């Protein structure tokens, strides 16, 4: 068998910690990607933050995000999508309403690096 059974209820990660990067990317795109495409993403960000700060996001929905972020930082886009996928599995709706934006960001940020498309 396996029987997962895992829980964690502690203070960790910060909105400005998951946004710092997510935001650092935008600016990058802002000066690369179309103003429309970038505008779209940004718009999504505003939500992410709102939903994040607001508290509409789950604790395990943040700890998971940071992951994708941490990766995007190391350029581990492959990972970003990975974690992003895991989130799209359960917390698909949660991430939704903005996720779409990130989904794009990743690709974008990735492209910037050099390679594009998985």
UniProtKB/Swiss-Prot annotation:
GO terms for molecular function: transcription coactivator activity. The keyword Transmembrane does not apply. This is Steroid receptor RNA activator 1. SRA1 RNA exists in a ribonucleoprotein complex containing NCOA1. The RNA also forms a complex with PUS1 and RARG in the nucleus. Interacts with AR. The gene is Sra1. It is found in: Nucleus; Cytoplasm. The keyword Transcription regulation applies. It comes from the Eukaryota. Belongs to the SRA1 family. One of its GO terms (cellular component) is cytoplasm. Keywords: Activator, Apoptosis, Cytoplasm, Nucleus, Phosphoprotein, Receptor, Ribonucleoprotein, Transcription, Transcription regulation. Appears to be the first example of a new class of functional RNAs also able to encode a protein. GO terms for biological process: apoptotic process; negative regulation of myoblast differentiation; regulation of transcription by RNA polymerase II. Functional RNA which acts as a transcriptional coactivator that selectively enhances steroid receptor-mediated transactivation ligand-independently through a mechanism involving the modulating N-terminal domain (AF-1) of steroid receptors. Also mediates transcriptional coactivation of steroid receptors ligand-dependently through the steroid-binding domain (AF-2). Enhances cellular proliferation and differentiation and promotes apoptosis in vivo. May play a role in tumorigenesis.
């Amino acid at each position: 068998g396996s029987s997962g059974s895992s829980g964690v209820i502690e203070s960790e990660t910060l909105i400005e910690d998951v946004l710092r990067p997510l935001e650092q990317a935008l600016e990058d795109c802002h000066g690369h990607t179309k103003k429309q495409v970038c505008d779209d993403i940004s718009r999504r960000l505003a939500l992410l933050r709102e939903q994040w700060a607001g508290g509409k996001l789950s604790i395990p929905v943040k700890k998971r995000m940071a992951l994708l972020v941490q990766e995007l930082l190391h350029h581990q886009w492959d990972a970003a999508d990975d974690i992003h996928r895991s989130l799209m599995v359960d917390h698909v709706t949660e991430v939704s309403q903005w996720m779409v934006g990130v989904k794009r960001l990743i690709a974008e940020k990735k492209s910037l690096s050099g390679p594009s498309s998985g």
